[PDB]
Design a protein around this nucleic acid. Structure first.
Ligand SMILES: [Mg+2]
Ligand SMILES: [Mg+2]
Ligand SMILES: [Mg+2]
Ligand SMILES: [Mg+2]
Ligand SMILES: [Mg+2]
Ligand SMILES: [Mg+2]
Ligand SMILES: [Mg+2]
Ligand SMILES: [Mg+2]
Ligand SMILES: [Mg+2]
Ligand SMILES: [Mg+2]
Ligand SMILES: [Mg+2]
Ligand SMILES: [Mg+2]
Ligand SMILES: [Mg+2]
Ligand SMILES: [Mg+2]
Ligand SMILES: [Mg+2]
Ligand SMILES: [Mg+2]
Ligand SMILES: [Mg+2]
Ligand SMILES: [Mg+2]
Ligand SMILES: [Mg+2]
Ligand SMILES: [Mg+2]
Ligand SMILES: [Mg+2]
Ligand SMILES: [Mg+2]
Ligand SMILES: [Mg+2]
Ligand SMILES: [Mg+2]
Ligand SMILES: [Mg+2]
Ligand SMILES: [Mg+2]
Ligand SMILES: [Mg+2]
Ligand SMILES: [Mg+2]
Ligand SMILES: [Mg+2]
Ligand SMILES: [Mg+2]
Ligand SMILES: [Mg+2]
Ligand SMILES: [Mg+2]
Ligand SMILES: [Mg+2]
Ligand SMILES: [Mg+2]
Ligand SMILES: [Mg+2]
Ligand SMILES: [Mg+2]
Ligand SMILES: [Mg+2]
Ligand SMILES: [Mg+2]
Ligand SMILES: [Mg+2]
Ligand SMILES: [Mg+2]
Ligand SMILES: [Mg+2]
Ligand SMILES: [Mg+2]
Ligand SMILES: [Mg+2]
Ligand SMILES: [Mg+2]
Ligand SMILES: [Mg+2]
Ligand SMILES: [Mg+2]
Ligand SMILES: [Mg+2]
Ligand SMILES: [Mg+2]
Ligand SMILES: [Mg+2]
Ligand SMILES: [Mg+2]
Ligand SMILES: [Mg+2]
Ligand SMILES: [Mg+2]
Ligand SMILES: [Mg+2]
Ligand SMILES: [Mg+2]
Ligand SMILES: [Mg+2]
Ligand SMILES: [Mg+2]
Ligand SMILES: [Mg+2]
Ligand SMILES: [Mg+2]
Ligand SMILES: [Mg+2]
Ligand SMILES: [Mg+2]
Ligand SMILES: [Mg+2]
Ligand SMILES: [Mg+2]
Ligand SMILES: [Mg+2]
Ligand SMILES: [Mg+2]
Ligand SMILES: [Mg+2]
Ligand SMILES: [Mg+2]
Ligand SMILES: [Mg+2]
Ligand SMILES: [Mg+2]
Ligand SMILES: [Mg+2]
Ligand SMILES: [Mg+2]
Ligand SMILES: [Mg+2]
Ligand SMILES: [Mg+2]
Ligand SMILES: [Mg+2]
Ligand SMILES: [Mg+2]
Ligand SMILES: [Mg+2]
Ligand SMILES: [Mg+2]
Ligand SMILES: [Mg+2]
Ligand SMILES: [Mg+2]
Ligand SMILES: [Mg+2]
Ligand SMILES: [Mg+2]
Ligand SMILES: [Mg+2]
Ligand SMILES: [Mg+2]
Ligand SMILES: [Mg+2]
Ligand SMILES: [Mg+2]
Ligand SMILES: [Mg+2]
Ligand SMILES: [Mg+2]
Ligand SMILES: [Mg+2]
Ligand SMILES: [Mg+2]
Ligand SMILES: [Mg+2]
Ligand SMILES: [Mg+2]
Ligand SMILES: [Mg+2]
Ligand SMILES: [Mg+2]
Ligand SMILES: [Mg+2]
Ligand SMILES: [Mg+2]
Ligand SMILES: [Mg+2]
Ligand SMILES: [Mg+2]
Ligand SMILES: [Mg+2]
Ligand SMILES: [Mg+2]
Ligand SMILES: [Mg+2]
Ligand SMILES: [Mg+2]
Ligand SMILES: [Mg+2]
Ligand SMILES: [Mg+2]
Ligand SMILES: [Mg+2]
Ligand SMILES: [Mg+2]
Ligand SMILES: [Mg+2]
Ligand SMILES: [Mg+2]
Ligand SMILES: [Mg+2]
Ligand SMILES: [Mg+2]
Ligand SMILES: [Mg+2]
Ligand SMILES: [Mg+2]
Ligand SMILES: [Mg+2]
Ligand SMILES: [Mg+2]
Ligand SMILES: [Mg+2]
Ligand SMILES: [Mg+2]
Ligand SMILES: [Mg+2]
Ligand SMILES: [Mg+2]
Ligand SMILES: [Mg+2]
Ligand SMILES: [Mg+2]
Ligand SMILES: [Mg+2]
Ligand SMILES: [Mg+2]
Ligand SMILES: [Mg+2]
Ligand SMILES: [Mg+2]
Ligand SMILES: [Mg+2]
Ligand SMILES: [Mg+2]
Ligand SMILES: [Mg+2]
Ligand SMILES: [Mg+2]
Ligand SMILES: [Mg+2]
Ligand SMILES: [Mg+2]
Ligand SMILES: [Mg+2]
Ligand SMILES: [Mg+2]
Ligand SMILES: [Mg+2]
Ligand SMILES: [Mg+2]
Ligand SMILES: [Mg+2]
Ligand SMILES: [Mg+2]
Ligand SMILES: [Mg+2]
Ligand SMILES: [Mg+2]
Ligand SMILES: [Mg+2]
Ligand SMILES: [Mg+2]
Ligand SMILES: [Mg+2]
Ligand SMILES: [Mg+2]
Ligand SMILES: [Mg+2]
Ligand SMILES: [Mg+2]
Ligand SMILES: [Mg+2]
Ligand SMILES: [Mg+2]
Ligand SMILES: [Mg+2]
Ligand SMILES: [Mg+2]
Ligand SMILES: [Mg+2]
Ligand SMILES: [Mg+2]
Ligand SMILES: [Mg+2]
Ligand SMILES: [Mg+2]
Ligand SMILES: [Mg+2]
Ligand SMILES: [Mg+2]
Ligand SMILES: [Mg+2]
Ligand SMILES: [Mg+2]
Ligand SMILES: [Mg+2]
Ligand SMILES: [Mg+2]
Ligand SMILES: [Mg+2]
Ligand SMILES: [Mg+2]
Ligand SMILES: [Mg+2]
Ligand SMILES: [Mg+2]
Ligand SMILES: [Mg+2]
Ligand SMILES: [Mg+2]
Ligand SMILES: [Mg+2]
Ligand SMILES: [Mg+2]
Ligand SMILES: [Mg+2]
Ligand SMILES: [Mg+2]
Ligand SMILES: [Mg+2]
Ligand SMILES: [Mg+2]
Ligand SMILES: [Mg+2]
Ligand SMILES: [Mg+2]
Ligand SMILES: [Mg+2]
Ligand SMILES: [Mg+2]
Ligand SMILES: [Mg+2]
Ligand SMILES: [Mg+2]
Ligand SMILES: [Mg+2]
Ligand SMILES: [Mg+2]
Ligand SMILES: [Mg+2]
Ligand SMILES: [Mg+2]
Ligand SMILES: [Mg+2]
Ligand SMILES: [Mg+2]
Ligand SMILES: [Mg+2]
Ligand SMILES: [Mg+2]
Ligand SMILES: [Mg+2]
Ligand SMILES: [Mg+2]
Ligand SMILES: [Mg+2]
Ligand SMILES: [Mg+2]
Ligand SMILES: [Mg+2]
Ligand SMILES: [Mg+2]
Ligand SMILES: [Mg+2]
Ligand SMILES: [Mg+2]
Ligand SMILES: [Mg+2]
Ligand SMILES: [Mg+2]
Ligand SMILES: [Mg+2]
Ligand SMILES: [Mg+2]
Ligand SMILES: [Mg+2]
Ligand SMILES: [Mg+2]
Ligand SMILES: [Mg+2]
Ligand SMILES: [Mg+2]
Ligand SMILES: [Mg+2]
Ligand SMILES: [Mg+2]
Ligand SMILES: [Mg+2]
Ligand SMILES: [Mg+2]
Ligand SMILES: [Mg+2]
Ligand SMILES: [Mg+2]
Ligand SMILES: [Mg+2]
Ligand SMILES: [Mg+2]
Ligand SMILES: [Mg+2]
Ligand SMILES: [Mg+2]
Ligand SMILES: [Mg+2]
Ligand SMILES: [Mg+2]
Ligand SMILES: [Mg+2]
Ligand SMILES: [Mg+2]
Ligand SMILES: [Mg+2]
Ligand SMILES: [Mg+2]
Ligand SMILES: [Mg+2]
Ligand SMILES: [Mg+2]
Ligand SMILES: [Zn+2]
Lengths: 70, 97, 95, 107
RNA sequence: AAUCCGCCUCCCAACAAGCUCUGCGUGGUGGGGAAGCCCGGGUGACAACCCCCCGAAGCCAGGGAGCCAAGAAAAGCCUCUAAGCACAACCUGCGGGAACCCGUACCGCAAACCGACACAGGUGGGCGGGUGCAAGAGCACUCAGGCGCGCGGGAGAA
RNA sequence: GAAUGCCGGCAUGAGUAACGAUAAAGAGGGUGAGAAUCCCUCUCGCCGUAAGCCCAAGGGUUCCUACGCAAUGGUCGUCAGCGUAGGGUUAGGCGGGACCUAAGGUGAAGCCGAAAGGCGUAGCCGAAGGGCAGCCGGUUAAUAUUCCGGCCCUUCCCGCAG
RNA sequence: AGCCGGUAGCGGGCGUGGAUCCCUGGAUGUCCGAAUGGGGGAACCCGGCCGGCGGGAACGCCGGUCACCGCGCGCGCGGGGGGAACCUGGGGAACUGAAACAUCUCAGUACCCAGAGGAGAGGAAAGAGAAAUCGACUCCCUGAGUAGCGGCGAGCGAAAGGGGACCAGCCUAAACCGUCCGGCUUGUCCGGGCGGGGUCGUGGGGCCCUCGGACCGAAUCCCCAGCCUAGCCGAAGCUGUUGGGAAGCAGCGCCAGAGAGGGUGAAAGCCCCGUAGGCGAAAGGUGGGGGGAUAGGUGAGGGUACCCGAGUACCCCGUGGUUCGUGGAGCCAUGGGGGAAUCUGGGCGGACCACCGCCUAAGGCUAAGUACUCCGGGUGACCGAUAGCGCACCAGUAC
């Protein structure tokens, strides 16, 4: 994930509601499981994508937490 | 064998000093010490039972401060005490110290 | 946030685990803390099936060394889930 | 906080000491943790390679070995002379490397 | 508190019965299935699966008798009632659903446990076949099963 | 230069004692760079109230398979409880917990003690005792009262009927 | 301007649209641990209540919440545990020394325990002690191994005063006034709370008359400088030569508020990192310095004799502290018994008495100068792998 993609992901995440952020985290966690399954059968040469998704999820939960603190 | 709830008098450590011989004041050679060993002096603790706001209250107090319990009872007459437990009555009396 | 995809980590890749597909028993690595009841729900909402039986066993990590450094592989937990008659989990049918 | 490097990939540097003293070349790579640079066509060494997929036929390759960063000096692109570097605060005001002999930018 | 339990009295029943519970046998049904031969598996085989005898220290069990040294508790269970509540609640039958956590590999009289050792030592419970010897868990041999003890080859003195 | 000094290294004794039960071995075939020592077959011997089988402690992957032999193994080693790697432990009914209490421990109330702390009816904790529902067979290289097959069973929730 | 820790590689990615990295704040933070729903053999197990998830009632999962004690009107605030030394308090040895040993010594040390905090203790005279005197306390020097204490043995060992460091002083109780509450023995009452008043030794205060009407200022709060937690700029050398290599040798230069030091292929002021001299914080911490608030602070006579800290002083008995070991044994402290007074009161000046003076007990607080070094930095006629920490290294490890 490039910096520009990270900035853009944060901007778009900060426009979603808590309910929308939760559905998206849930979708990305199933995406992360699918990456796991492909990794375990040696079919994921682009292994950087596992780190990328996990930090995407972290960023989403961080914004989810922002919206719920106040 | 403990602590006076009124004065705070507490067991202290004192030496027991065994002496021999005639004192110099009586024309003797002088007193010699055949032993010094630690011991404890206790407060003269006794029980003082007393009725305050219809409830029996018990104090463990050095005999020297027995009258101080009754003073606390006298001063207790000006207190909103009825309906309370013995533990709670006791705390009030002691607060007037 | 806790989801079905935090409970189901990876499939178990072995001859013994593959032997179970032919009768609807699929074997996963599950989170060591995960309960049979929550593994049931996790499998069902991930793979769109009905679970009628769950077996679990802890798999202790193997002690291993690299030179002078003795260590341990992480502990793990296996779940065998039985799916309703006629159902299948195509992701594992794989093979 | 960070290793100080008076030279970067890839400006033009003079190799002012060692067997290759006098050579001019581009900095291909900078290795801060070794305080070393790799200058194109300088510090060449023969490395043994096994018969392998990467190197069939095997034999040897030629490699650029790192040079201590203090052995190297940038060539100013304005006056074309080897120079110590100075710092200049622009009007931005960002900071830039500038040649010490004239005053041209090195970047 | 009590309709229960205890105590007193009467009636019937009483070593019978009745109710109840357990063991064993049978029981729709499901299995197993040898020697030998052939390369753990195939065959034997549509295997047969019956009769007699011996017989426990185990089971029926909370059995019986004798004895003095006079031989846990609590819950489950049943019964009684109190607040309550009596459209609830509990009981019986039936039906559908629900049923979590941890252990399970392997050694285990030992080379994997305790003894610094792959140590002639120590380690609690159960099964422990057959024949003969008066009996037996003794002794000799031997079944199933397991071993020849993790240096050997000679020689044939003190 | 000495302290039966301290730490380390290396000698002598010495190719010496020993190689850990006197139950015991022989041959043929195979593998391999290498075989008394590994695998296979035949023969021989030893245990058989065990030197066989099952369980509880304790131990903690030593289990199975492939590839290995520097070291570990009192010799050897192609072998192994050894090195590397992969695999392997499946339960409402077995054991323990969501049940009970024993000694004992802890401990509302309460009692005592310079402090720390010591006690203490109830209660709670505490088991290999009480209580509680699964038998037989098949299957894996390695688990099975756990998987499967057959025939049974327990509790909880809801519902119906009585 | 490179980067994805030590860590290379495989297989993939990121960065001047500013990454990696460093600092500050925030978010997340499984389980155990004071551990605190309950239990427990720490890191496991088992619950109640509210809300949510699944087909969900049984079952399970997610979020919140639920220990105990103290204080204050079911709810709030506080406590618990830890910290290398340092500190205070409560307890408290022995070897040893006395060339034996008991008093005595070691030593109120070691150690146990409770508590404290960046310090802690102490502290604003019921002091000292002879100066017609001094003026809280702490800490250093000195007084002084003096005075003394001592089986007058071994040994133990002050204080005043002088020189310095620092500097600071406050709040209450009681008389009297007011108010609220309740007691029962009805008011001119007694008691409890709160507010006012008052705080001293030339004695001070209360009340009552007579007389008189702005300046100080915190140890508390606010702001700021300064400081810390990242960083940044920083002068001046080329050539030849021997050599693997120059920084050595040679020639000619240059800088210097910088010729401390460490690197670079050897021995470099001018190659690199620095050094002298300067510069720097949005954020958090600090802020004893500067500024500003606020709290608090403030007369004189005369009379009155109302108050001035009680089981206390004081005496006696048993002890401790002190240089003081029973001594002529005062002083300070107090376990037991007896037991006052309110300034014409009381304690002290080493038995005691008189005289002469000093001081104001039985309530509380109080910076700074002082101690220590887990932590960061600087510096060594400190060590240099048997040394130096037990550990230069995956050590409180292997064993
Ligand atoms: Mg990021
Ligand atoms: Mg005495
Ligand atoms: Mg005398
Ligand atoms: Mg005389
Ligand atoms: Mg004497
Ligand atoms: Mg008594
Ligand atoms: Mg009495
Ligand atoms: Mg007294
Ligand atoms: Mg008295
Ligand atoms: Mg989370
Ligand atoms: Mg298989
Ligand atoms: Mg769930
Ligand atoms: Mg299980
Ligand atoms: Mg690991
Ligand atoms: Mg820089
Ligand atoms: Mg050079
Ligand atoms: Mg040149
Ligand atoms: Mg910038
Ligand atoms: Mg009755
Ligand atoms: Mg029957
Ligand atoms: Mg039967
Ligand atoms: Mg029958
Ligand atoms: Mg049949
Ligand atoms: Mg057969
Ligand atoms: Mg056969
Ligand atoms: Mg057939
Ligand atoms: Mg036939
Ligand atoms: Mg036939
Ligand atoms: Mg018998
Ligand atoms: Mg009987
Ligand atoms: Mg008898
Ligand atoms: Mg009996
Ligand atoms: Mg009992
Ligand atoms: Mg009970
Ligand atoms: Mg009623
Ligand atoms: Mg049913
Ligand atoms: Mg549970
Ligand atoms: Mg389990
Ligand atoms: Mg075990
Ligand atoms: Mg098993
Ligand atoms: Mg087994
Ligand atoms: Mg076995
Ligand atoms: Mg064995
Ligand atoms: Mg066995
Ligand atoms: Mg034996
Ligand atoms: Mg046995
Ligand atoms: Mg055995
Ligand atoms: Mg062993
Ligand atoms: Mg052993
Ligand atoms: Mg052996
Ligand atoms: Mg043995
Ligand atoms: Mg035995
Ligand atoms: Mg038999
Ligand atoms: Mg015969
Ligand atoms: Mg016989
Ligand atoms: Mg015989
Ligand atoms: Mg016989
Ligand atoms: Mg026999
Ligand atoms: Mg015999
Ligand atoms: Mg025998
Ligand atoms: Mg024999
Ligand atoms: Mg036989
Ligand atoms: Mg045999
Ligand atoms: Mg043998
Ligand atoms: Mg042999
Ligand atoms: Mg042998
Ligand atoms: Mg011979
Ligand atoms: Mg000598
Ligand atoms: Mg010797
Ligand atoms: Mg010797
Ligand atoms: Mg000798
Ligand atoms: Mg020696
Ligand atoms: Mg020597
Ligand atoms: Mg030695
Ligand atoms: Mg030696
Ligand atoms: Mg030798
Ligand atoms: Mg030797
Ligand atoms: Mg010989
Ligand atoms: Mg000899
Ligand atoms: Mg010999
Ligand atoms: Mg021999
Ligand atoms: Mg022998
Ligand atoms: Mg032998
Ligand atoms: Mg052969
Ligand atoms: Mg052979
Ligand atoms: Mg061999
Ligand atoms: Mg061989
Ligand atoms: Mg063999
Ligand atoms: Mg036999
Ligand atoms: Mg072991
Ligand atoms: Mg191993
Ligand atoms: Mg096995
Ligand atoms: Mg193994
Ligand atoms: Mg094996
Ligand atoms: Mg092999
Ligand atoms: Mg070997
Ligand atoms: Mg070998
Ligand atoms: Mg070898
Ligand atoms: Mg060996
Ligand atoms: Mg060997
Ligand atoms: Mg051996
Ligand atoms: Mg081989
Ligand atoms: Mg072995
Ligand atoms: Mg192995
Ligand atoms: Mg190897
Ligand atoms: Mg395998
Ligand atoms: Mg079952
Ligand atoms: Mg159970
Ligand atoms: Mg439950
Ligand atoms: Mg229990
Ligand atoms: Mg219980
Ligand atoms: Mg208590
Ligand atoms: Mg206790
Ligand atoms: Mg008890
Ligand atoms: Mg219970
Ligand atoms: Mg229990
Ligand atoms: Mg039990
Ligand atoms: Mg039992
Ligand atoms: Mg059971
Ligand atoms: Mg059955
Ligand atoms: Mg087995
Ligand atoms: Mg198996
Ligand atoms: Mg079954
Ligand atoms: Mg009905
Ligand atoms: Mg890495
Ligand atoms: Mg690559
Ligand atoms: Mg790469
Ligand atoms: Mg920026
Ligand atoms: Mg942070
Ligand atoms: Mg979790
Ligand atoms: Mg916790
Ligand atoms: Mg807890
Ligand atoms: Mg507990
Ligand atoms: Mg709920
Ligand atoms: Mg479902
Ligand atoms: Mg639900
Ligand atoms: Mg929860
Ligand atoms: Mg909860
Ligand atoms: Mg405490
Ligand atoms: Mg404590
Ligand atoms: Mg603390
Ligand atoms: Mg003390
Ligand atoms: Mg204390
Ligand atoms: Mg003391
Ligand atoms: Mg002390
Ligand atoms: Mg003692
Ligand atoms: Mg002594
Ligand atoms: Mg000594
Ligand atoms: Mg001495
Ligand atoms: Mg001496
Ligand atoms: Mg002596
Ligand atoms: Mg002596
Ligand atoms: Mg002596
Ligand atoms: Mg002595
Ligand atoms: Mg002393
Ligand atoms: Mg000490
Ligand atoms: Mg503490
Ligand atoms: Mg300070
Ligand atoms: Mg203080
Ligand atoms: Mg104080
Ligand atoms: Mg004062
Ligand atoms: Mg003098
Ligand atoms: Mg002394
Ligand atoms: Mg002085
Ligand atoms: Mg002075
Ligand atoms: Mg100073
Ligand atoms: Mg002053
Ligand atoms: Mg009134
Ligand atoms: Mg009053
Ligand atoms: Mg009042
Ligand atoms: Mg005044
Ligand atoms: Mg006056
Ligand atoms: Mg103040
Ligand atoms: Mg610079
Ligand atoms: Mg410079
Ligand atoms: Mg040359
Ligand atoms: Mg040169
Ligand atoms: Mg020169
Ligand atoms: Mg200098
Ligand atoms: Mg220098
Ligand atoms: Mg230098
Ligand atoms: Mg020089
Ligand atoms: Mg030099
Ligand atoms: Mg230099
Ligand atoms: Mg400076
Ligand atoms: Mg500077
Ligand atoms: Mg006046
Ligand atoms: Mg008066
Ligand atoms: Mg006073
Ligand atoms: Mg008082
Ligand atoms: Mg006295
Ligand atoms: Mg005295
Ligand atoms: Mg004394
Ligand atoms: Mg004297
Ligand atoms: Mg005295
Ligand atoms: Mg006097
Ligand atoms: Mg006294
Ligand atoms: Mg006195
Ligand atoms: Mg006076
Ligand atoms: Mg007087
Ligand atoms: Mg006095
Ligand atoms: Mg006196
Ligand atoms: Mg005086
Ligand atoms: Mg100050
Ligand atoms: Mg202070
Ligand atoms: Mg201070
Ligand atoms: Mg200091
Ligand atoms: Mg330091
Ligand atoms: Mg040196
Ligand atoms: Mg040196
Ligand atoms: Mg060394
Ligand atoms: Mg060392
Ligand atoms: Mg050396
Ligand atoms: Mg050392
Ligand atoms: Mg260190
Ligand atoms: Mg180590
Ligand atoms: Zn230039």
């Amino acid at each position: 994930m490039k910096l520009s993609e990270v900035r853009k992901q944060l901007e778009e995440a900060r426009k979603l509601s808590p309910v929308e952020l939760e559905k998206l985290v849930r979708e990305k966690k199933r995406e992360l499981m699918e990456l796991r399954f492909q990794a375990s059968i040696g079919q994921l040469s682009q292994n950087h994508k596992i780190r990328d998704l996990k930090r995407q999820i972290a960023r989403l939960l961080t914004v989810l937490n922002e919206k719920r603190r106040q | 064998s403990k602590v006076c709830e009124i004065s705070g008098k507490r067991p202290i450590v004192a030496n027991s000093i065994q002496r021999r011989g005639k004192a110099k004041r009586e024309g003797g050679v002088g007193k010699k010490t055949t032993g010094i060993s630690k011991r404890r002096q206790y407060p003269n603790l006794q029980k003082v039972r007393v009725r305050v706001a219809g409830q029996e209250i018990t104090f463990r107090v050095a005999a020297s401060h027995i009258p101080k319990v009754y003073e606390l009872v006298e001063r207790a007459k000006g207190l909103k005490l009825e309906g309370l437990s013995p533990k709670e009555i006791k705390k009030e009396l002691l607060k007037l110290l | 946030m806790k989801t079905a995809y935090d409970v189901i980590l990876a499939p178990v890749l072995s001859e013994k685990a593959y032997a179970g597909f032919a009768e609807g028993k699929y074997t996963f690595w599950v989170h060591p803390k995960a309960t049979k009841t929550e593994i049931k729900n996790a499998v069902e909402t991930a793979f769109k099936v009905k679970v009628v039986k769950v077996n679990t066993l802890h798999v202790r990590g193997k002690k291993k060394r690299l030179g002078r450094y003795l260590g341990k592989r992480p502990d793990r937990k296996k779940a065998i889930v039985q799916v309703a008659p006629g159902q299948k989990i195509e992701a594992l049918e794989g093979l | 906080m960070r290793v100080k490097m008076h030279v970067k990939k890839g400006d033009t540097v003079l190799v002012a000491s060692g067997k290759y003293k006098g050579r001019v070349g581009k900095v291909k790579e900078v290795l801060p943790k070794k305080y070393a640079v790799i200058v194109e066509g300088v510090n060449i060494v023969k490395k043994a390679v096994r018969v392998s997929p990467k190197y069939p036929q095997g034999g040897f390759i030629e490699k650029e070995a790192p040079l201590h960063a203090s052995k190297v000096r940038p060539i100013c692109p304005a006056c074309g002379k080897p120079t110590r570097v100075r710092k200049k605060f622009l009007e931005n005001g960002k900071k830039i490397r500038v040649c010490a002999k004239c005053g041209g930018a090195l970047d």
